[PDB]
Scaffold this active site. Structure first.
Site, short mmCIF file in Angstrom:
data_model
loop_
_atom_site.label_atom_id
_atom_site.label_comp_id
_atom_site.label_asym_id
_atom_site.label_seq_id
_atom_site.Cartn_x
_atom_site.Cartn_y
_atom_site.Cartn_z
N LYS B 53 -6.92 -12.66 48.89
CA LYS B 53 -5.43 -12.78 49.56
C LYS B 53 -4.63 -13.68 49.28
N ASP B 147 -4.26 -9.28 67.50
CA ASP B 147 -3.74 -8.35 66.59
C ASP B 147 -4.71 -7.20 66.24
OD1 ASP B 147 -4.24 -10.93 64.03
OD2 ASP B 147 -5.56 -8.95 64.17
N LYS B 149 -5.72 -3.71 65.53
CA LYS B 149 -5.42 -2.58 65.69
C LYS B 149 -6.08 -2.02 64.44
CE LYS B 149 -2.07 -4.40 62.15
NZ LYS B 149 -0.54 -4.22 61.57
N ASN B 152 -6.93 -3.38 60.91
CA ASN B 152 -7.53 -4.66 60.55
C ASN B 152 -9.28 -4.27 60.51
OD1 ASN B 152 -4.90 -5.56 60.96
ND2 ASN B 152 -5.94 -7.14 62.17
N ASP B 165 -8.37 -10.29 58.69
CA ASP B 165 -6.86 -10.78 59.06
C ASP B 165 -6.62 -11.26 60.37
OD1 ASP B 165 -3.79 -8.46 58.41
OD2 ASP B 165 -3.87 -10.83 59.33
N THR B 182 2.00 -5.57 67.23
CA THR B 182 2.33 -4.14 66.87
C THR B 182 2.69 -3.60 68.18
OG1 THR B 182 0.76 -3.96 64.85
CG2 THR B 182 1.64 -1.97 66.14
#
Ligand SMILES: O=P(O)(O)OP(=O)(O)OP(=O)(O)OC[C@H]1O[C@@H](n2cnc3c(NCCc4ccccc4)ncnc32)[C@H](O)[C@@H]1O
Ligand SMILES: O=P(O)(O)OP(=O)(O)OP(=O)(O)OC[C@H]1O[C@@H](n2cnc3c(NCCc4ccccc4)ncnc32)[C@H](O)[C@@H]1O
Ligand SMILES: Nc1ncnc2c1ncn2[C@@H]1O[C@H](COP(=O)(O)OP(=O)(O)NP(=O)(O)O)[C@@H](O)[C@H]1O
Ligand SMILES: [Mg+2]
Ligand SMILES: [Mg+2]
Ligand SMILES: [Mg+2]
Ligand SMILES: [Mg+2]
Lengths: 1182, 309
Positions: B53, B147, B149, B152, B165, B182
Site C-alpha cells: 500500500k 470505518d 464497511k 474494508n 484499512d 462514509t
C-alpha cells in the site's frame, strides 16, 4: 380535509371541546360537505402506531420463553391508562359525598331545626363549586380512554393484516374470509368505547366501603342487611354473565358459514340468475339463520335478567335495612330520605357498573387471546435468492397435499434461454408442478434449484380494483416504451380502442366489466411486464380464438422474450414443435422427457431495484318515519306496546290513590314534605317493568330482525343486473355482517332501557304534579332546553354517523380482494404496496370515526353544564327564601331537580337509541331496490331487429340481427375474442337492457313472465359457479333426485373416478370455492348439471374451456347422445367443435352474418383460414 | 478463560505499543483508492506474494491527515489477532510510504454481495460472529475502528473475514470529536458534531448486518444532506423476508439513543452475544476456525487475481 384543529387548540379550549363548534355550525344549516372533514392527528396515523406496537411484540417474542400478547399492549399504554383512571376515581368519589351537603340543605326547611339553618349558606356555597369540580374531572378522562381504545384497535388490526399476507398454504384452508370478517367486525366499535368501563373493577369496592362507612353514621349495625342482599344479587348476576358468555361462544360458529355462503352467492349472481336458483339460496340461508336466532333469542333473556336488577332492587334494599331499626325504636322521617339518597348511589355502584366492567374484561381479554393465537400459525418460508444460477434443476421430487402422491419421480433440467413445454391430460399434475416450483407446495423429497426470481400467470385470472394501466404495471415505475411494446405485442390494442376513456377505464373488483379473453390477456401482459429469470405461463391460451392465440404465441412468447427461460403449459401439437424439451405427465407420474424429435420415435433488456395520507379523493365515495316503518313491520309489537301502556296507567293510578290517602315513625305537619321526596326517590321500583312486560318485548324486537333480513335477501336476489354493479363486495359484507349483528343484539335491550327510563320520568312527573301543580311549571325551562340542545346536536350527528358508517367498506373490499391474489402477490413480491394501501384505508376510517366521538363528548358535557347552572341558580334562590320559618319555595324548587337527575340519563339514552337506528335506515335502502322486470315443444326460434346494450343510454354492443333457427338444429356461434358472442346468448335470457322481438315456437317473449320464460333455457356459464357444500347439494340444490339417477349421469361425463377418490362418495364437503377439484373437472360438473336438467333449448358457452382432445371426446359423445333431439347454440373456439354444426353465425363489427355451410365460411377470410393447424385442416377438407 | 485471554492480550499489547522498494514486483494493481495505490508484489528471496500500500506524503499533508497514517502504521504493527490482516515490513522513501501486508486471495466481500444480491440469514450470521469477536478484541484494548464497511473486509482461502484499512483508527480513552467516515455508516452523535465514544462501532455493525441481509443499506438517499436527515430521524422500515428475531436485533443495534445502545449499557458484549440470533454459533470453536465456512472462494494459485477487478 386538512389540518386537524386539535393539535393547534389551547388547553382551556380542549378542556371544554370548544374546537368542535365550527363543524356543528357548518352542518346545522345545510349538508356537511367533504371540505368540512379534518386530517387525522399525526399520533393517530396507522403507520407510526403499528410499528410502535410491533416494536414491543417482536421484543416479547425474542426475549421470553412464554410470550403473551398482553405485554406489548401493557408496555405501550399502561401509564397513560392509569393516569386517566386516577381522575376517573375522583369523578366517582365526589358523587357519593353529595348527600352529606344535600340532606342538610333540604333539612333547613324546618322552623325547629335551629342550628341546621343558621349555617346553611356556607353549605350552599360548598355545594356550588362541588358540581363544578365534578363535571371537569370526569369527561376528559373518558375521552382519553376512548382515544386509547381506538389506538389499540388500529394497531391490532394493522398487525393482523400484516400477519395475514405471510400464511402458509396448509393453514389457508382453515381460514376463510368469513372468519376474518367476523374477527374484525365484532370488535370494530365496541372495543374503542368499552375502554371507559374497565376501570370500575377496582373503583366499585373502594366506593362500597366508603358508602357503608357513611351509612354506619345513620343506622349503626343494622345496615348490613342491605349489604348481604346486594352481595347475593351480585353473585346471581355473575352466574347470569357465565351463562350469557356460554351462549355467545356457542353461537359464534354459524355466522362465518352464513357469511361465506352469502358472499359466494352474491358474487356469482350471474350464474344464479341463469340457473334460476334465486329461491334455493334463500332456503339454504334461512336454514342457517334459524339456529342462530334460536341461540341469540335465548341469550337475550339472560341479558334482560342481568339488566333488570337495578330497577327492582331499589325498594327492597332500603326497606330491609331500615325496617329493623324502626322496629326497635322510633325513627325520624328524615333518616329514611337520607338513607335513600345514599342507597341510590350504592345501587348504581354495585348493580350497574361492576358487572359491566367484569364483562368488558371477559370480552377484551378473550379477543386479545384470540388474536395472540392467530399470530402463531405456520408461515411461508421464502425461496433462496441467488442471481447466478442460470439453470433450473429438478430432481427426485415427490409431493403430497396432505394416500397417492400428487407427483412421483419428477426431474428435468433446462439452461438459460431454453423453452420447455409441459403437456399432459387433465388432472395429471400440470398446475401442481408450477405450485411446487413457486414454493407454495414444498416437496417432501428431492430439491429444486433456480434463481428465485419468477413471474407468474395464474390459470385463474385475477384482477384487483384499478385501471388497466395500473393492473399491468402493478405497482412499479412507469415506462413509456416498455408499456407500449407490451400492450401492442399482446394484441390488446385492438380492444383498448373500444373503451370510452381508452386506457383509464375503471375496473371493478374481479374485472366483471371485461370479457374472459380480455382479462386473460391483461393477466398475460402483467406477467410479461415483470422482469424475471423464470417465467411460469399456466395455459394462457384457453379463451383465445386460434388467430389471436397463434399471433400472440408467435409474437410475444417466441420473439419478444426469446432470451428468457420460460415454461409454457400447453396441449397443442404445434407448440411442442417450437420447444426444446417436452414433459408429458399422466396420473401424477412422468411419462416422457426428451427432445421433440424423440417423441416421434432486446426489448426486455433489464431492470433495476404510497403516500399513506388522504389528500382529497379517497373521502369522496362516502358522500321521523324510520321509527314508524320499524315499529309497524311486525303486527304483534304494537299490541305489546299498548299492553305496556295499559299496565303503566294502572300502576300510576294506584300510586296516586295511595299517595293521596295518608307509632313507629315520627311525622309532623311541619316535616310532612318528606313524603313526596321519598316517593320521587323510590319511584324507580314502583313503575318498573317486570318480566310479564319485559320478556315479550325482547322476544318481539328480535322477531322483527328476521323479517327484515329475509326481506333484504329477497330484494337483493331480485334486483336487475345493471344496479347490482353499482355495489361493491365490501358494502355487501358490511350490510350483512354489521347491520344485522347490531339489529339482533344491541338494539332491543337499548330500546328496553330507554323505554324504562322514559316511563319512570313520565310517571313521576304525572303523579307528583297532580297533588299540587307547581313542579310542572317549575320544570318547563329545563325540559325545553334539554330538547333544543338535543335537536341542534342531532342535526349534525346523523350526518357524521352516516359518514362513519360508510368508512368501513373499503376495509372489507381490500380484505376480500387480498385473499384471492395471495399467490400472485407472493410470486411478484408486492406485499409492502398492499400494506400501504390497507393503512391508507384504516386512516380513511379513523378520519370519520374521530369526529363523531368528539361531538358526542361536546354534547354530553354541555347537557351536564346546563344541569349544573340550573342547580346552582335554583339552590341560591331556595336557600335565600328561608327567612325564619316554613320555606315553601324550596320545598317545591329543590324537589323539582330530583326528577331532572334521571331525565338527564333518559336524554343520554335517547342519543344512543338514535345512533343505533342508523343501521335500520341503511337496511331499508336495500329493500327499496328496484325489481327486475308443454310450451317449449320444438325449439324453433326467430329474432327481429334485436339490439342489446349493458346500460340504458349507453353504447350499443350489437343491433339489427334477424337470423332464424330451425327446430333441432345445431348452431355454431363464432367470432373473435371479444365481439358480442356471449352478449348474443345472454340477450336471450333478458339479463341486460334489450329491445326487439323473440318468437320461440310462436309465443312472443313479452307474453310470458320472466321466471317462466327463462326456465326453458339450459345454460353452461363461461364463469363456473361452485359454492360451499356437498357434491349432491352442488349437483341439485333442490333434492329432487336421489342418488340413482345421479350415478347414472355422473359416469357418462367421466366423473366416476373423480368423485370416488375422496373419503365421502357423493358427500365430500367442497370448501373454499371448491378448490379441491382441478380446473378441468369443473367443466364436467357444469356439463353434468346441464345433463340432469333436460331442457329443449340449450345455450352452451365454452363447454370445453381447457380440456385437451382426449377428454373432449366425452363432451362430443354426450352432445350427440344425451340430448341429441334438442337444439343447441354451441359457442366455442375449438375448430374441431365446428364439425358437427350445420348452421353458423359469425359475429363481426357489431352485426351477425349467417352461413349454412362450413366450406363457404372459410373462403371469405384468408388470415383465419391460414391459421388453423394441419390436423383439423385435413379433418375438414377431403 | 476468555477473561484471562483478554488480560494477557492487553498486557502484551503495551510492550509492542511502546516499542514501534528494491525487493518488490509490480505484477498487478488491486485498486488504488484515495491517496495512493496498492500493488501486488512477489518476494524475490522466498517467493511469497504480498500486497504493498503506497501513501502520498503531499496528499497526506494537504488533506490534514498525518496523525491518521502514523497511528495506523503503529496500530497495525502492535495488534495481533487471527481475523486481522498482519503487517510484515514498513518502508520509508523520499517519495512515498509503503507497507507490506499479507496477501488475501479471496478478494472483496462487496463484489460477492453485489454478485449474489443478498445472503441468507445463516450466511450473514457466520460473518457477524467474526465481526463481533473482532470488535470485542479491539475495544478491550481501547481502540476504535470507526470505518467499518464492506469495502474494508476481505475473504481468505478458508472463507473467514480479513480486516484491513486501519486508516481512521485511533487508540483513545474517553471522548472524541473528529468527523470522518462514509455517510450511510455514520452514527447520529457524530453527525450532530458532538463528542462520541466507542459505541459507534455497534451502529456500524447494525447497518452492516442490515445491508448484508437485504442487499441495500437502510439509510440511503441522493444527497448526503438528505442522508444526514434520514440518519438523525432514525426511521427505518424492514423488508418482508426479515425474521422477527433479526428485526429485534437490528432495532436494538440501530437505536439513535446513545445511552440504551446495544453493547454499551451494562455488559458490553454479552447483550449481543447472548441474543437469540446467535443461539447456534459456538464462539469458542469459531474463534479457532473449526467450523465449516458456508462460502469458499475459488483461488487459482498465489498469483491468481481473478476475484479482484
Ligand atoms: O386443470 P387441468 O385440467 O389443466 O389439470 P391439472 O392442472 O393438472 O390439475 P391439478 O391442479 O394439477 O390437480 C391434480 C390433482 O390434485 C387434486 N387437488 C387439487 N387441488 C387439491 C387440494 N387442495 C389443497 C391445497 C390447496 C389448493 C388450492 C388453494 C389452497 C390449498 N387437495 C387435494 N387434492 C387436490 C386434484 O383433484 C387433481 O386430482
Ligand atoms: O370470451 P370471449 O373471448 O369470447 O369474449 P366475448 O364472448 O365476446 O365477451 P363479450 O361479453 O361479448 O364482450 C363484448 C364487449 O362488451 C363489453 N362488456 C362485456 N360484458 C360487459 C359488462 N358487464 C357488466 C354488466 C352485465 C349485465 C348483464 C349480465 C352480465 C353483466 N359491462 C360493460 N361492458 C361489458 C366487453 O368489454 C366487450 O368489449
Ligand atoms: N492485504 C491485501 N491483499 C490484497 N489486496 C488488498 C489487501 N488490502 C487491500 N487490498 C486491496 O487493495 C485495495 C485498497 O487497499 P486499502 O487498504 O483499502 O487502501 P485505502 O486507500 O486506504 N482504501 P480506501 O480508504 O477505501 O480508499 C482494496 O480494495 C483491496 O481490494
Ligand atoms: Mg390447469
Ligand atoms: Mg366468452
Ligand atoms: Mg483507498
Ligand atoms: Mg479500503
Amino acid at each position: 380535509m386538512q389540518r386537524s384543529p386539535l393539535e393547534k387548540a389551547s388547553v382551556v379550549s380542549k378542556l371544554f371541546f370548544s374546537w368542535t363548534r365550527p363543524i356543528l355550525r357548518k352542518g346545522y344549516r345545510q349538508r356537511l360537505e367533504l371540505s368540512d372533514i379534518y386530517q387525522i392527528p399525526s399520533v393517530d396515523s396507522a403507520d407510526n402506531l403499528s410499528e410502535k406496537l410491533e416494536r414491543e411484540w417482536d421484543r416479547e417474542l425474542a426475549s421470553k420463553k412464554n410470550p403473551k400478547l398482553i405485554n406489548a399492549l401493557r408496555r405501550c399504554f399502561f401509564w397513560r391508562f392509569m393516569f386517566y383512571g386516577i381522575f376517573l376515581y375522583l369523578g366517582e368519589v365526589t358523587k357519593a359525598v353529595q348527600p352529606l351537603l344535600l340532606g342538610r340543605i333540604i333539612a333547613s326547611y324546618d322552623p325547629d331545626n335551629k342550628e341546621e339553618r343558621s349555617i346553611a349558606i356556607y353549605l350552599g356555597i360548598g355545594l356550588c363549586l362541588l358540581f363544578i369540580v365534578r363535571t371537569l374531572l370526569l369527561h376528559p378522562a373518558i375521552f382519553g380512554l376512548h382515544h386509547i381504545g381506538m389506538q389499540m384497535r388500529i394497531a391490532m388490526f394493522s398487525l393482523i393484516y400484516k400477519k395475514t399476507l405471510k400464511l402458509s398454504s396448509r393453514v389457508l384452508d382453515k381460514i376463510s374470509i368469513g372468519q376474518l370478517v367476523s374477527l374484525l367486525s365484532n370488535n370494530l366499535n365496541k372495543f374503542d368505547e368499552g375502554l371507559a368501563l374497565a376501570h370500575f373493577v377496582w373503583i366499585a369496592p373502594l366506593q362500597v366501603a366508603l358508602l357503608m362507612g357513611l351509612i354506619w353514621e345513620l343506622l349503626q349495625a343494622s345496615a348490613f342487611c342491605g349489604l348481604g342482599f346486594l352481595i347475593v344479587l351480585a353473585l346471581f348476576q355473575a352466574g347470569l354473565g357465565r351463562m350469557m358468555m356460554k351462549y355467545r361462544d356457542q353461537r359464534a360458529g354459524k355466522i362465518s358459514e352464513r357469511l361465506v355462503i352469502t358472499s359466494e352467492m352474491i358474487e356469482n349472481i350471474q350464474s344464479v340468475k341463469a340457473y334460476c336458483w334465486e329461491e334455493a339460496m334463500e332456503k339454504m340461508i334461512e336454514n342457517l339463520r334459524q339456529t342462530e336466532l334460536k341461540l341469540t333469542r335465548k341469550a337475550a333473556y339472560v341479558r334482560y335478567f342481568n339488566s333488570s336488577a337495578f330497577f327492582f332492587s331499589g325498594f327492597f334494599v332500603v326497606f330491609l335495612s331500615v325496617l329493623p331499626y324502626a322496629l326497635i325504636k322510633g325513627i325520624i322521617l328524615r333518616k329514611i330520605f337520607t338513607t335513600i339518597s345514599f342507597c341510590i348511589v350504592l345501587r348504581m355502584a354495585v348493580t350497574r357498573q361492576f358487572p359491566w366492567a367484569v364483562q368488558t374484561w371477559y370480552d377484551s381479554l378473550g379477543a386479545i387471546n384470540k388474536i395472540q393465537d392467530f399470530l402463531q400459525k405456520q408461515e411461508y418460508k421464502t425461496l433462496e435468492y441467488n442471481l447466478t444460477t442460470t439453470e433450473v434443476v429438478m430432481e427426485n421430487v415427490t409431493a403430497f397435499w396432505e394416500g397417492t402422491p400428487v407427483l412421483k419421480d419428477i426431474n428435468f433440467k433446462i439452461e438459460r434461454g431454453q423453452l420447455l413445454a409441459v403437456a399432459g391430460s387433465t388432472g395429471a399434475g400440470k398446475t401442481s408442478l408450477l405450485m411446487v416450483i413457486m414454493g407454495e407446495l414444498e416437496p417432501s423429497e428431492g430439491k429444486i434449484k433456480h434463481s428465485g426470481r419468477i413471474s407468474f400467470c395464474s390459470q385463474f385470472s385475477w384482477i384487483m380494483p384499478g385501471t388497466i394501466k395500473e393492473n399491468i404495471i402493478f405497482g412499479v415505475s412507469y415506462d413509456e416504451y416498455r408499456y407500449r411494446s407490451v400492450i401492442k405485442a399482446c394484441q390488446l390494442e385492438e380492444d383498448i380502442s373500444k373503451f370510452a376513456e381508452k386506457d383509464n377505464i375503471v375496473l371493478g373488483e374481479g374485472g366483471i366489466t371485461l370479457s374472459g379473453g380480455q382479462r386473460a390477456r391483461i393477466s398475460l401482459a402483467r406477467a410479461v411486464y415483470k422482469d424475471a429469470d423464470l417465467y411460469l405461463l399456466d395455459s394462457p391460451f384457453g379463451y383465445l380464438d386460434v388467430l389471436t392465440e397463434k399471433e400472440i404465441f408467435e409474437s410475444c412468447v417466441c420473439k419478444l422474450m426469446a432470451n428468457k427461460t420460460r415454461i409454457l403449459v400447453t396441449s397443442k401439437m404445434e407448440h411442442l414443435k417450437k420447444a426444446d424439451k417436452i414433459l408429458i405427465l399422466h396420473e401424477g407420474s412422468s411419462y416422457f422427457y426428451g427432445t421433440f424429435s424423440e417423441l416421434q420415435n432486446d426489448i426486455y433488456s433489464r431492470r433495476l431495484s404510497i403516500s399513506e395520507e388522504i389528500n382529497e379523493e379517497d373521502l369522496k365515495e362516502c358522500f321521523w318515519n324510520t321509527y314508524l316503518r320499524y315499529i309497524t313491520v311486525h303486527k304483534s309489537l304494537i299490541f305489546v306496546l299498548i299492553w305496556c301502556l295499559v299496565i303503566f296507567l294502572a300502576e300510576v293510578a294506584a300510586s296516586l290513590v295511595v299517595l293521596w290517602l295518608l307509632y313507629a315513625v315520627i311525622i309532623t305537619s311541619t316535616s310532612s314534605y318528606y313524603v313526596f321526596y321519598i316517593y320521587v326517590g323510590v319511584a324507580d321500583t314502583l313503575l318498573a317493568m317486570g318480566f310479564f312486560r319485559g320478556l315479550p318485548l325482547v322476544h318481539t324486537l328480535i322477531t322483527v330482525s328476521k323479517i327484515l333480513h329475509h326481506k333484504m335477501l329477497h330484494s337483493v336476489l331480485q334486483a336487475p343486473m345493471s344496479t347490482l354493479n353499482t355495489l361493491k363486495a365490501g358494502g355487501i359484507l358490511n350490510r350483512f355482517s354489521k347491520d344485522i349483528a347490531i339489529l339482533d343484539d344491541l338494539l332491543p335491550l337499548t330500546i328496553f332501557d330507554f323505554i324504562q327510563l322514559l316511563l319512570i320520568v313520565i310517571g313521576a312527573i304525572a303523579v307528583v304534579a297532580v297533588l299540587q301543580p307547581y313542579i310542572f311549571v317549575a320544570t318547563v325551562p329545563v325540559i325545553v332546553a334539554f330538547i333544543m340542545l338535543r335537536a341542534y346536536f342531532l342535526q349534525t350527528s346523523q350526518q357524521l354517523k352516516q359518514l362513519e358508517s360508510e368508512g368501513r367498506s373499503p376495509i372489507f373490499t381490500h380484505l376480500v380482494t387480498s385473499l384471492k391474489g395471495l399467490w400472485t402477490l407472493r410470486a411478484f413480491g408486492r406485499q409492502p404496496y398492499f400494506e400501504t394501501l390497507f393503512h391508507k384505508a384504516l386512516n380513511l376510517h379513523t378520519a370519520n370515526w374521530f369526529l363523531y366521538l368528539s361531538t358526542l363528548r361536546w354534547f354530553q358535557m354541555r347537557i351536564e353544564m346546563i344541569f349544573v347552572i340550573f342547580f346552582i341558580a335554583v339552590t341560591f334562590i331556595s336557600i335565600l327564601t328561608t327567612g325564619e320559618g316554613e320555606g315553601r319555595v324550596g320545598i317545591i324548587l329543590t324537589l323539582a331537580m330530583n326528577i331532572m337527575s334521571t331525565l338527564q340519563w333518559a336524554v343520554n339514552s335517547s342519543i344512543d337509541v338514535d345512533s343505533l337506528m342508523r343501521s335500520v335506515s341503511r337496511v331499508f335502502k336495500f329493500i327499496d331496490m328496484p325489481t327486475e322486470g308443454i310450451w317449449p315443444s320444438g325449439g324453433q326460434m326467430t329474432v327481429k331487429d334485436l339490439t342489446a346494450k349493458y346500460t340504458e343510454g349507453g353504447n350499443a354492443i350489437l343491433e339489427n340481427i334477424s337470423f332464424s333457427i330451425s327446430p333441432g338444429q345445431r348452431v355454431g356461434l363464432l367470432g373473435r375474442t371479444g365481439s358480442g358472442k356471449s352478449t348474443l346468448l345472454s340477450a336471450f335470457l333478458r339479463l341486460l337492457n334489450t329491445e326487439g322481438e323473440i318468437q320461440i315456437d310462436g309465443v312472443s317473449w313479452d307474453s310470458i313472465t320472466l321466471q317462466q320464460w327463462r326456465k326453458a333455457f339450459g345454460v353452461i356459464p363461461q364463469k363456473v359457479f361452485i359454492f360451499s357444500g356437498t357434491f349432491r347439494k352442488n349437483l341439485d340444490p333442490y333434492e329432487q333426485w336421489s342418488d340413482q339417477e345421479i350415478w347414472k349421469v355422473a359416469d357418462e361425463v367421466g366423473l366416476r373416478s373423480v368423485i370416488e377418490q375422496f373419503p365421502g362418495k357423493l358427500d365430500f364437503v367442497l370448501v373454499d370455492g371448491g378448490c379441491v377439484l382441478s380446473h378441468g373437472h369443473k367443466q364436467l360438473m357444469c356439463l353434468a348439471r346441464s345433463v340432469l336438467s333436460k331442457a329443449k333449448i340449450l345455450l352452451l358457452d365454452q363447454p370445453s374451456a381447457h380440456l385437451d382432445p382426449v377428454t373432449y371426446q366425452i363432451i362430443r359423445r354426450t352432445l350427440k347422445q344425451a340430448f341429441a333431439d334438442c337444439t343447441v347454440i354451441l359457442c366455442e373456439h375449438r375448430i374441431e367443435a365446428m364439425l358437427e354444426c350445420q348452421q353458423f353465425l359469425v359475429i363481426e363489427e357489431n352485426k351477425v352474418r349467417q352461413y349454412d355451410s362450413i366450406q363457404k365460411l372459410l373462403n371469405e377470410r384468408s388470415l383465419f383460414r391460414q391459421a388453423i393447424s394441419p390436423s383439423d385442416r385435413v379433418k375438414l377438407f377431403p | 478463560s476468555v477473561k484471562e485471554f483478554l488480560a494477557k492480550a492487553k498486557e502484551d499489547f503495551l510492550k509492542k505499543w511502546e516499542n514501534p522498494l528494491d525487493q518488490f514486483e509490480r505484477i498487478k494493481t488491486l485498486g488504488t483508492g484515495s491517496f495512493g495505490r496498492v500493488m501486488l508484489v512477489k518476494h524475490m528471496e522466498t517467493g511469497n506474494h504480498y500486497a504493498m500500500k503506497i501513501l502520498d506524503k503531499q496528499k497526506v499533508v494537504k488533506l490534514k491527515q498525518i496523525e491518521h497514517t502514523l497511528n495506523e502504521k503503529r496500530i497495525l504493527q502492535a495488534v495481533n489477532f487471527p481475523f486481522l490482516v498482519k503487517l510484515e515490513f514498513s518502508f520509508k522513501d523520499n517519495s512515498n510510504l509503503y507497507m507490506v501486508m499479507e496477501y488475501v486471495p479471496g478478494g472483496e466481500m462487496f463484489s460477492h454481495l453485489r454478485r449474489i444480491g443478498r445472503f441468507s440469514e445463516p450466511h450473514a450470521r457466520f460473518y457477524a460472529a467474526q465481526i463481533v469477536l473482532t470488535f470485542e478484541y479491539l475495544h478491550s484494548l481501547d481502540l476504535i475502528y470507526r470505518d467499518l464497511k464492506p469495502e474494508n473486509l476481505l475473504i481468505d482461502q478458508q472463507g473467514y473475514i480479513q480486516v484491513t484499512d486501519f486508516g481512521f483508527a485511533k487508540r483513545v480513552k474517553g471522548r472524541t470529536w473528529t468527523l470522518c467516515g462514509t455517510p450511510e455508516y455514520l452514527a447520529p452523535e457524530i453527525i450532530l458534531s458532538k463528542g462520541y465514544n466507542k459505541a459507534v462501532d455497534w451502529w456500524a455493525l447494525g447497518v452492516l448486518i442490515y445491508e448484508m441481509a437485504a442487499g441495500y443499506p437502510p439509510f440511503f438517499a441522493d444527497q448526503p444532506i438528505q442522508i444526514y436527515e434520514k440518519i438523525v430521524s432514525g426511521k427505518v422500515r424492514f423488508p418482508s423476508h426479515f425474521s422477527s428475531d433479526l428485526k429485534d436485533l437490528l432495532r436494538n443495534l440501530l437505536q439513535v439513543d446513545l445511552t440504551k445502545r446495544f453493547g454499551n449499557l451494562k455488559n458490553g458484549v454479552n447483550d449481543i452475544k447472548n441474543h437469540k440470533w446467535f443461539a447456534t454459533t459456538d464462539w469458542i470453536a469459531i474463534y479457532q476456525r473449526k467450523v465449516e465456512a458456508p462460502f469458499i472462494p475459488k483461488f487459482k494459485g498465489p498469483g491468481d487475481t481473478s476475484n479482484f477487478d
